[PDB]
Structures are given as C-alpha cells and as structure tokens.
Amino acid sequence: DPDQICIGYHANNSTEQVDTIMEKNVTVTHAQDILEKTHNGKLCDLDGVKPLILRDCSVAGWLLGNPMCDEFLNVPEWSYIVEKINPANDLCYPGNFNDYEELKHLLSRINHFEKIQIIPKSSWSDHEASGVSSACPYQGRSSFFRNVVWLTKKDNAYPTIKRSYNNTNQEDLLVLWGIHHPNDAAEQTRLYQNPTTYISVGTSTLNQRLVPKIATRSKVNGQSGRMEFFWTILKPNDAINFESNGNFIAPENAYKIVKKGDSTIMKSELEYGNCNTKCQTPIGAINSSMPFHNIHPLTIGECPKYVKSSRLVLATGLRNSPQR
C-alpha cells in the first residue's frame, strides 16, 4: 500500500475523427469543423438591400424596354442582379446588342440608374414615330421597345434628322440607339423612302457612321428584318449628335448612373426569397461563422472562403483512447 502519483491525459466518449498525412479517421477528444456545408436555398436581400430579379427578362430586354419587361421600367436601387441562363424576354425584334458583354461588365459596378426622357416621342414632327412590330407584342397588339423609337417616313418623305442632346446632369448617362437592317430594296423605300442611308453619331469621343445591311435572312420571332443596337456613356457637359436619312432607331429615354459600387450579375433560376443575408450565392444564402465553405465559387458579400473540399476538420484535442 505505498503511496503513488501517476501522470496521464484526458479521454472521453468522443467519436470525432480527423485525418493526418500518415493516418485517416483518427478519433480525437476534441475537433473543430471549419467548413460550412449548408445554405438556405434562397435569394435574399444583401445587407438590407434587395436584388434586382430580372425574372424572364435579360439585361438587354430591361434596358431597351422590351414590352414584356414593363415591371423593370424604373427599378429601385439594387445590391446584385439576377438573370436566368436563357431569359425568354430579350430582343423582341431580332438582332443584336453591340458590345453587349462589355455593357454587362459596366453593370457589375452600378447599383442604381435614374431613367430620364432625353428625346420626347412627341418631338418628331417630320417623321412617323409610331413604328411597331408583331415581334414585340404587348397585350396582344404589335408594340415596340419602350426606351427607343422606330422612326419612319411621313408623306413619302424622310428628311435628314439632325438632333443633339447635351448631358446637363452631374452624372454619366447611358444612351441607347439602333439601326434597322431591312429585308430588301423595296422594303427600304417603303419604310424610309431613301434607298441609300446612314446614321452618324458623335460625342467628344464617339465617331460612328452606320450603313444598313440588306440581306436575306431566316425568320426569328416572325421577322427576317434585324435591329442592331449601340450604347455609349455620355459624360456630364458633353453632347451627343445624331444625323440620319433613314433606318434610325432613335433614343427616347437614357439612364443616369446615380449610384456606383459593388454589384454582380448572378446567373440563377431561383426566385426572390423574402430574406436577408450577409453572403449570397447563386444557389442559396450563407449564414455562417466558418472560415471556409463549399457551396458555390461565385459569391457576393461578407463570405467565408470557397474551397472544393467535402470535409475540413482540425484536431484540437488529443488522440482519444479510453482504457478498458
């Protein structure tokens, strides 16, 4: 019965496992998971600011004002933009948006537009401004883009247009306009009278002169004609000058860039989730204090760091071997 002192270490009922280089599944007394693996599956407000959910509209359909996209005529400030992979409501009248991807890039740094009328539809005296197409229906009637104007001849005449707009606002202005590419020579004269036409556009930096391209093309949304759209950023105190004797899709409304900051165009099929988050991904929001996550590489907000790992666990305690 002599007295004794022993040296030992803690054990418990933990079944937590960690990996090392030389062994896997080592049971430890304590461990710390450092990987967030769950999300709420929703699109939420970011730090109290609601996203712009484009629903069935594309960026092009919104900005040009496809009639199907009237929900988005005057959107409020946003935190990020959500777009579907293939939005149904794009360019109702078939064609293309020149430098479309660069334009979308600019959007990733914009939080709020203020749309303003720059050239009133009423102001066209010597031209018809009511051009419509069945490619752009609204309430079952042929209509047109809301923000630009289809000008055609009046009294078998299309006099040369000379119109200027001076940006007297303190903000940069996004201006949109287009050109119509007709089907044939007869269509050209039927719409615009003049057989040979152009649009010239000038600012302090822009030097554009466009000529319509007549070509035989496949029907798209019921039309073989095409519209090609252009954009520019008009600086405060600079003016834009349009000249045309036909095929001109005139600006009506332009966009003041009123708020700039962090934004992104997120590709997602999800709808609005009536929720708030600090960290958003295209497949759901993250509410976590973990340093890492494996939800999705594309995030915005105050987020954990993304890794492709299925599991990340640090040993904190010691090798768990209770006696028996």
């Binding site: 007295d3 803690h10 071997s321 209770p322």
Partner: peptide, 26 residues
C-alpha cells in the same frame, strides 16, 4: 512515445484538463 505508448490509455475521470495527475495516499 507517451500517449497510447508507455502510458497505455487516457483517463475519463479527469474532466479537469488535458494532462494531469492521479494520486493515492492514506
């Protein structure tokens, strides 16, 4: 060589810390 070494196993009875002592006297 200590943990699961010359000291065969850990103590569930020591809930106090990671390492320590067991004594037995009168």
């Amino acid at each position: 060589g200590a943990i699961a070494g010359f000291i065969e196993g850990g103590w569930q009875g020591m809930v106090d810390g990671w390492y320590g002592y067991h004594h037995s006297n009168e």
